[PDB]
Design an enzyme around this catalytic site. Sequence first.
Site, short mmCIF file in Angstrom:
data_model
loop_
_atom_site.label_atom_id
_atom_site.label_comp_id
_atom_site.label_asym_id
_atom_site.label_seq_id
_atom_site.Cartn_x
_atom_site.Cartn_y
_atom_site.Cartn_z
CG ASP A 1 -11.13 -4.73 -5.20
OD1 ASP A 1 -12.13 -3.97 -5.24
OD2 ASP A 1 -9.97 -4.32 -5.08
CG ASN B 1 -3.45 -3.02 5.65
OD1 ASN B 1 -3.38 -3.90 4.80
ND2 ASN B 1 -3.60 -3.29 6.94
CB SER C 1 -7.15 -9.17 2.29
OG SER C 1 -6.84 -8.31 3.38
CB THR C 2 -1.83 -10.65 4.46
OG1 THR C 2 -1.87 -9.28 4.89
CG2 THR C 2 -0.94 -10.77 3.23
CD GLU D 1 -5.09 -4.98 2.04
OE1 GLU D 1 -4.94 -3.81 1.64
OE2 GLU D 1 -4.66 -5.39 3.14
CD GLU E 1 -8.11 -6.81 -3.56
OE1 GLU E 1 -8.28 -6.09 -2.59
OE2 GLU E 1 -8.27 -6.37 -4.72
#
Length: 501
Positions: free
Chosen positions: A87, A150, A94-95, A8, A92
Amino acid sequence: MHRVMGIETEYGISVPHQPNANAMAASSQVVNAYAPIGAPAQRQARWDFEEENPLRDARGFEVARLTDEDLGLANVILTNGARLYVDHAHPEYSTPEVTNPRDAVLWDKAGERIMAEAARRAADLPMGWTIQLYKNNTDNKGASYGCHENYLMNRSTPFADIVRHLIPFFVTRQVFCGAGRVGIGADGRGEGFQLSQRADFFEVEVGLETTLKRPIINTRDEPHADPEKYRRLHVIIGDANMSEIATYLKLGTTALVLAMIEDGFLSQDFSVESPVGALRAVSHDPTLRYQLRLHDGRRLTAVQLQMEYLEQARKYVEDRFGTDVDDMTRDVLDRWETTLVRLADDPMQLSRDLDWVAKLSILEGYRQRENLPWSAHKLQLVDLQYHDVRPDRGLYNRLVARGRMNLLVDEAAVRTAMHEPPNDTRAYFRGRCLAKFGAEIAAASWDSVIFDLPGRDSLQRVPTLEPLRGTRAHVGDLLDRCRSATELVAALTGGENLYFQ
């Protein structure tokens, strides 16, 4: 290599000619400018760290009771399985869920293209702003923004072992992961070049915060999966990388270390005295000579300590897989080792591979041509230019246009990944449903797709709770043969021909 992972990335944002411009409103314009290409996110389509934004609950979910643009609520699901949102007052991306570092690179690179296109589209809307976006981590005003990683892990792995083996690895990873930064200290007023954008913004070893009192090991652990079975490892220490080799090594080497931790393979104690201090000291010495102080009294450069992790990873893979090592694992190990060998000998040999080296080479060219000291403002401008998302203005992008960087994927694959999901996670089902059945989708999130079927009173929620189901192998043929969402839902909810999802 096979582990659920993601990235992200918070993008820097600038609206030229507007002093003190509302970054929140500009970020909302970027996201909203790309909304026609995707579907609205459900309320729960959030990562836990989004709690640190206005008008949210403890989970980052919007609450009721100023315009939504000034609050940064925009949140869009894309047909490639990614999510685009605001964000920390920044756009932002996020994959989608991916299973390996090459796919992480590919869909993260698609995110840069999506950001560039979103900014172009924002300018074309009536009353729209002209907006610049930068894939970096600092604004040169003492501000820092995050590139989050993550990794899905077993909930049974002891967290104390995760912490003890990851801290020394994270303190030293920047030797190949750093993006480079002109200026020393959080305010950037100390004179010199350093390996990492983020190092000066960290304060503690372990903690829950992400936007202040920043920890080397962030403890937010909530997965987009069953929390009884899985822990999410949420990493905030890394710089956003432009180079595909740097992003690949960042995720791939970390994944190998996580595999060793989960299997209890590491018997060594690599603990470092004052790890936050070591993080800064490693960053502040781009000659790579600084020797860390281990708790046992050993003195090792950051490169040497990385080599100890590499040697363990090779032994782990040889013992677990023997000669059946998969291609990508072999490739990550080989590139990690070759990079460390070259770093110890002459880092400037790595200018086609590593961001901080490629950037330093450009900066040294300015220093030589113009007799500029490290304090010169022009060098901070060049530092920032490296990360501009525009194809003709970003310096990394101009290097690629000349074939001067090593790549892992080709541009045609990047363009495809802007619109098509990975094939081996639930992002496949989510993205393909949005592309083929978008007319009948009310909303989506990591956990479900919401269908509106004509002639059915209630919305139909299809859960997608396991990240490794809903892949092309599971549902691709079904999605191909269904002509409507009504047919799709009837198949997925049938009890005789079972779809495990």
